């Protein structure tokens, strides 16, 4: 058996694995949409920034909760991570609205471990959660609407021309 | 049509989307040989080390192709991503065999691609390779060999002995 | 004879002087694209600086294609320069797709002598090519196809705010 | 009409432009000039170097008076430029002749656009001329009889052993 | 057989062993030249630091190619080396003409390797010569045939004194 | 005759040259020994530069004794070098035992010509050595033989293992 683990659920440890599929589709999902914002044809460079740096903090995420899972004594394991849900990302307000669902999506499935870790008894699980994941969460999540407002107001006036300035003066 | 593109077959096109494939799974191969070496019943900081940073230098590289892919006119295409061959990768020699064989494959595509790029007279994809890509490939692959003989040699004298010697004074 | 030359074809040579033709006509281009957007019934100075940085780029093109003519022993031969294509150069877009057009030109120019120096087994040529003008053209054509997207983008909005906005926040 | 034009002769203006295409021939002669020089079998650097600064002066003025051109709001029209009148140099003196008469051409050039000014009461231009290039001749001229006179005394008294002391010695 | 040679024929191993011969002659040979001039009755001090300089130039360029030969997986096998093809070297311009000859016959080794490189689709090979040989041999090929158009120049005037003003003054 | 000489033996001047051929012969010889332990199945990257230190040391001493030997108003004559000895090296011991042999050959050549010098009444000749070479070897071949126990000491236990180790902490 393992020598350090100690209430430490079998539960637990295989939606720490899943949670670690879903941070590593969603860095891939990021690199994907910061790519399409370089392509000659889009060519919005705040966006495509923006992006990138998205995909490095979803791969942190996944290198923090595979940290957490081998000092907790549970095994890492690793399954096939499916492409992202889009090769071609439309608009700004496309992107950042699939950026929130993602995100959202995320979140819940932080929330779901959270009430896991309650149920189990693992006070450690839920302090991490809450310590480098949660508020991580709610602060992107209101970056992202905060985002989405001002495209949205800047692309109901005139769209090429709002979605330009939204690169440039905001990102 | 694309308004950049000159001198960029379909071939090439897809040929470096195969190979961006290649290296994101390289990299996620080498996250899997890291998170081993760090579970307490491995326990080899230096080999851990070793390997998550050759995943994010297999990223970089991905980044380095998808980058060039949109400077030529391309358009980056991403699959799904199959996961490491193992869940488990055994002793120290045993893991550096293994990524001595993943490196050959990578550096296979890589001249495969060259070819292509030679058969297609496209001198920017050759010049691509040949300066980001081949020298680093050879230069990692002589390392591992290096690492791989004097694991051999250490491990055949006295094998637990061996492998901590080796982290401790190379790694 | 010449007490340097070595494996340098007159096939070659002719094509070096024809290149340097190619970019001194260029900056040329460029002078005049730059001094256009200078007028005060135009005035735009992003565009005009973008512009007159680039003729001086192509001079250092042509300077470094004559020392290397030199350095191999070949003649440098000077033809008359042909006035550039145009004595005004229309609105923003209209310039930057000019400028696409010439930077096409002069890397197919690149490409044909690349496979010309390939068929007289000249890798020395084949190396100075690639080294300092093939990766400088894409990155060059890239740029420029990322600020006519971005232009369009803007003047399809509102034609003289998106220059304007263009000029002031790109350029 | 133009904005801004003021007191700015047709004359005028049609003479900078002619003064422009003869600038720019000056600066590819010294193009010409200092790359002959550079030639494994003339091999003078010093003198490869001063013609090469010129080049980049006589652009320079080539610059400054299409600059003026837009200040005044005329409008910049660029011709043909015909190509240096040899393309091998001879001796350093029988470069350093062809140079200043090169140059007395310019000057010539300078003193009739003056004279065109005064004729038209346009004491702006006067002013701008007197200013950039009138002494900016006078100097050079003067250096180049220096020269001339150094030289020629120099290879009266042995050819090659004084070209090269100059070359080293002045140069 | 070799844990990690890849892609590197038994044809290109051969040749670079022989051309670590050819550049360790060379170096020899520079040796020779170096000391020559350092001898009390020659004494021309110019000559013999560029000469010592290149020897320890070309035992440089064999160390690379070693180094390159064991990163390939190949096998470095050494030969008798030939002493230099004089014991005395004549004067200046006599040495520089055997230099010349000297460097023309690496840089020939370098094309006729470059070309097995391509017939046996090595790019590694073909970017690896072109990198670190092929310009520098075009670069000190160049500077070499200066010098001896200078050295011929000055001793067609006086013989003693051009060859004293060389090493003086350009060396 | 030389302008310079002064008791300096014919016997002593040829015995000066035979000594080079040595010191060139043992640099070659160390040259060999670096880059087989370069090889990547041999792998020890401490011994290989041991090795390639000590080739520039033999042909410093070689430089050292050419300069002498202009300085006494001999003439440097090259011969032949001899390639090493072996084309592979064997083990750490096995490579300084080689290297010990080699050394005493050197010192012994040193001491024969040493007594020629006291023979030829030549008192800076045999304060050359003294100062330059003697005690030099003397050092070298303690330090050599001191590793040899360290190395004997240490593969008698277990050879893979002593050997690595030695290369680590005493290299």
Chains 1, 2, 3, 4, 5, 6 share one sequence.
């Not at 920034?49 to 979803?58: D, G, I, M, P, W």
């Not at 929130?100 to 932080?110: C, D, G, P, W, Y």
Request: proline share 2%; aromatic share 8%.
């Amino acid at each position: 058996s393992s020598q350090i683990r100690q209430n430490y659920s079998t539960e637990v440890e295989a939606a720490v694995n899943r949670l670690v599929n879903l941070y590593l589709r969603a860095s891939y999902t990021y690199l994907s949409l910061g790519f399409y914002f370089d392509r000659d044809d889009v060519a919005l460079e705040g966006v495509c920034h923006f992006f990138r740096e998205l995909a490095e903090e979803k791969m942190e995420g996944a290198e923090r909760l595979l940290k957490m899972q081998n000092q907790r004594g549970g095994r890492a394991l690793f399954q096939d991570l499916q492409k992202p849900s889009q090769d071609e990302w439309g608009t700004t307000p496309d992107a950042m609205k699939a950026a929130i669902v993602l995100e959202k999506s995320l979140n819940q499935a932080l929330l779901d471990l959270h009430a896991l870790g309650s149920a189990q008894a693992d006070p450690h699980l839920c302090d991490f959660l809450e310590s480098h994941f949660l508020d991580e969460e709610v602060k992107l999540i209101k970056k992202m609407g905060d985002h989405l407002t001002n495209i949205q107001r800047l692309v109901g006036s005139q769209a090429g021309l709002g979605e330009y300035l939204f690169e440039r003066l905001t990102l």
